[PDB]
Design a protein around this ligand. Structure first.
Ligand SMILES: Cc1cc2nc3c(=O)[nH]c(=O)nc-3n(C[C@H](O)[C@H](O)[C@H](O)COP(=O)(O)OP(=O)(O)OC[C@H]3O[C@@H](n4cnc5c(N)ncnc54)[C@H](O)[C@@H]3O)c2cc1C
Ligand SMILES: Cc1cc2nc3c(=O)[nH]c(=O)nc-3n(C[C@H](O)[C@H](O)[C@H](O)COP(=O)(O)OP(=O)(O)OC[C@H]3O[C@@H](n4cnc5c(N)ncnc54)[C@H](O)[C@@H]3O)c2cc1C
Lengths: 488, 490
């Protein structure tokens, strides 16, 4: 058995990667250790940038059905929300979607697209050479080996693949330990949403609702499986009461360990999601970071296997993604100190609350957390470069159409604004990789795109080239060659 | 011997207070423990707001002669300067002026103004009643007692007066212990500007040039009442860096901590506190001297008017109400810096996120306004946006050409600035002519001005605005503002 790509792990990163690779025509195999999907949710939502990418893929409507919209974001529980309304987006909020549902949506899509999913199959070894990768698998039908051009480790924080490769995972050892419980409580919870601060103990309890009458309770202590008795002991020792907790849906530990893989690639093997970055779950960023790693990698790897990509393209995945993960680790490492109730961090907490009240400071952190502000280094001076395209209302014949409906196939899009057509002929040699979207104009005059006549957008929604009337066609062919490969 | 005010301590807070009180006609006595002024400098400069206040008093030119202008400010040594150019000021910078020079300038002025300075005289006890204060003094000719209406403790962080009064000094215990030495080093200093990092030891050595070939050397240890000896600084240096680096020509030695405390109150009857006497914090961003100097400018005119018996009785109370939150803000930002300078790799994300935030213009401006004190806003029950803010040094167009607004504040009287041919304001303020000067201008020589939509402003002797009129508003509230800050009509 020979496949183009083998993916180890069917978490949200692996599943999105499988979808992206199928859009790019790669024969994909997804191997999942667990026999059945997990029954608890780690992540409780998706941020504004993930919603935009699901919209671009025509998956958005499926997630939004689970309606709850969080218009403000959390930054180290300081009481000053991260306002997402300040953004040029159709989704100025985070969506409350439990991971179990996110994974069910992505599984449906990956299967619909033709990705092969093998649940109960684990990767134990790997062998690499110039030609390909041979992966050692153990499944319910016994051990076997599968050949591929590329293997991707989407196997979580304890990633087997990362360790198999010998990739170092540098970072920081934890300074905090917490126990989590998704449970019901007979007694009434104290207000704090709920919780008890304990500066003396250097600990805190905090709870918030999941669904009516069910809470996620956390007990954090600063400087083996967790059992109900652990959570009850911890709850009693900090809040002073058991609270009559019953029917625990999930129990687990949590730490502020902060590590990133030294590299995201080692020959024909790549890492994505928790496999290349672990951090304190603060501000709800991991699933989104992993999902976005997949969207960046998927089209680049698919084009590499198709043999249409420039050889330096797959390398841009680590170059673009490492700083983004670095930024999540940086802000979470900052939050980890900020949540430590040690009175030593009071000036720091108070100065942060003040800075959070400064609009541009609030917007800078909101753009980080929501990922609406991700900027990749890109050739040129125009501000829009390396940035996402907004979901523009476009005017055409047969009415107005949203720019995101042109990205379902995960091809690049050359968006023209006006009667000028020497652009269509110059890009015709890339017609097989890029679609020309010829609009009369933008249905809204406000638009970040207004001074422009043309944009070249990558399959991930990131702009790589712009034309204004003065500029005219220059760098187009260069941008096409850089991101999509040689002409016809 | 009877004086209106007795000041304990001739540090920069005490000296500015003496100047201010003399402008307000108070017979002032300044008692200094040291026989001769100190030949070293703790502070190395003055921030933009202090320069504006020296300008208002006609002292500005004396400080600026010692030219070095620092257009950027430090924030926990993060490499991202606090840009002061973003401010509507004539001094968008900090001045490099060593404390010895600042004190020499203020002493010259206080003496010129007739304040009595007694060097080698220390306050040991105090007795207070409804009528006044009796202060116990020990000087070179022996002990004595002096009577006054008010005593002010400007006696530093270890303030004798604060302790005499029983005022609690709440705050936080140190987490950092460091030694400072202004010295010359025979050996070459390693790159840090200069210094050695020691994560294992959870300490660091740092140094920066004071003048060519002279450095301020700091050895900090994270997580010592006795005065530092030269050997102590050599030991600290040697523990961290392996060597003392040929240390000689020791100008100064000192201990330093991140102890962060503020006096529960700034007043206890007829006794007041100002400067280090009511607030200690980690010296980070160079804020203490400026905070103390600004406490003096706020207190001086209010106390002088109280002794003159022209002030409303609730005026002296506005000193603590206005100053406490300002000092609270310095302690807050310095408590934040104290963590940021701790070498534990645990604070890396925090340091890195702060550098990023410092690159956000409005975040940079918010901290720059804090540190420079250009953004100090006092609560005014009133609702116009300039209320409680400083007046910019406006170029004024008048008869006899253009004149700067700061040249009208030399006497430390209030100023009623009018911008227009409308004179129903001069008659309405005539009963306060003895406390407030009418500055009648044709307009502002600059279109930019924060004052552009206004026709009139009432400014306190400290340069803080307390009343405004726009063409629509007209005269409403002048008499109330005059009564609130200057007292009843004459
Ligand atoms: C308490 C908590 C709350 C969080 N809240 C949020 C939030 O609100 N928002 C957010 O964005 N993120 C949040 N996160 C982070 C988020 O849950 C993760 O970042 C996300 O699950 C990572 O997805 P993944 O696919 O990379 O890895 P995983 O989800 O860990 O899945 C990897 C998969 O690989 C499989 N596997 C492992 N070893 C092998 C092997 N040898 N062979 C084959 N398969 C293997 C595993 O069975 C697993 O299914 C939270 C995390 C925690 C702990
Ligand atoms: C290392 C270091 C660097 C600094 N850098 C800066 C900087 O660049 N910028 C800045 O703005 N600030 C800086 N500061 C802070 C600044 O030096 C102080 O805040 C400032 O000196 C306070 O002035 P003061 O008049 O309140 O108190 P002090 O300067 O301490 O003087 C109080 C005076 O009272 C006298 N006295 C004490 N007891 C008695 C008594 N019983 N009777 C009579 N007199 C008495 C003392 O002799 C002394 O002269 C720094 C401080 C340090 C330690």
């Amino acid at each position: 058995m020979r496949y183009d790509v083998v993916i180890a792990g069917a978490g949200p990163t692996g599943l999105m990667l499988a979808c992206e690779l199928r859009l790019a025509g790669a024969r994909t195999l997804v191997l999942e250790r667990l026999a059945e999907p997990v029954d608890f949710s780690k992540a409780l939502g998706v941020h504004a940038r993930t919603v935009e990418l699901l919209d671009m893929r025509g998956l958005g409507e499926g997630f939004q059905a689970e309606a709850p919209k969080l218009r403000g974001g959390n930054f180290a529980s300081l009481g000053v929300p991260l306002d997402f309304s300040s953004f040029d987006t159709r989704h100025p909020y985070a969506l409350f979607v439990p991971q179990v549902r996110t994974e069910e949506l992505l599984t449906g899509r990956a299967l619909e697209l033709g990705a092969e999913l093998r649940r109960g199959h684990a990767v134990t070894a790997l062998e690499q050479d110039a030609d390909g990768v041979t992966v050692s698998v153990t499944g319910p039908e016994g051990p076997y080996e599968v050949e591929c051009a590329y293997l991707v480790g989407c196997d979580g924080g304890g990633s087997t693949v990362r360790k198999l490769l010998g990739i170092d995972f540098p970072g920081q050892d934890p300074h905090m330990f917490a126990v989590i419980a998704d449970a019901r409580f007979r007694e009434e919870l104290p207000h704090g949403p709920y919780g008890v601060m304990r500066h003396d103990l250097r600990a805190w309890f905090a709870a918030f609702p999941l669904e009516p009458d069910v809470y996620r309770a956390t007990v954090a202590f600063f400087d083996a499986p967790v059992t109900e008795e652990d959570v009850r002991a911890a709850l009693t020792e900090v809040a002073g009461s058991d609270f009559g907790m019953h029917d625990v849906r999930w129990l687990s530990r949590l730490t502020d360990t902060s590590r990133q893989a030294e590299r995201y690639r080692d020959g024909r093997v790549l890492l994505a999601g928790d496999a290349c970055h672990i951090h304190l779950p603060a501000g709800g960023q991991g699933l989104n970071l992993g999902f976005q790693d997949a969207v960046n990698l998927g089209w680049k790897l698919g084009a590499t296997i198709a043999g249409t990509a420039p050889p330096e393209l797959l390398d841009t995945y680590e170059a673009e993604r490492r700083p983004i993960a670095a930024g999540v680790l940086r802000n979470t490492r900052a939050q980890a100190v900020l949540i430590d109730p040690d009175p030593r961090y009071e000036g720091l907490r108070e100065l942060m609350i003040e800075l959070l009240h400064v609009p541009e400071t609030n917007r800078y952190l909101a753009g980080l957390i929501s990922a609406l502000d991700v900027r990749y280094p890109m050739a040129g001076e125009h501000p829009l470069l390396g940035r996402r395209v907004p979901d523009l209302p476009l005017v055409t014949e047969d009415g107005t159409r949203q720019l995101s409906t042109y990205f379902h196939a995960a091809r690049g899009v050359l968006l023209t604004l006006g009667c000028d057509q020497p652009l269509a002929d110059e890009a015709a040699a890339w017609k097989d990789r890029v679609d020309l979207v010829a609009a009369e104009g933008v249905a809204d005059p406000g638009s970040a795109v207004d001074g422009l006549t043309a944009l070249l957008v990558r399959p991930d929604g990131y702009i790589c080239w712009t034309a204004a009337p003065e500029t005219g066609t220059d760098g187009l062919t260069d941008a096409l060659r850089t991101w999509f490969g040689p002409p016809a």
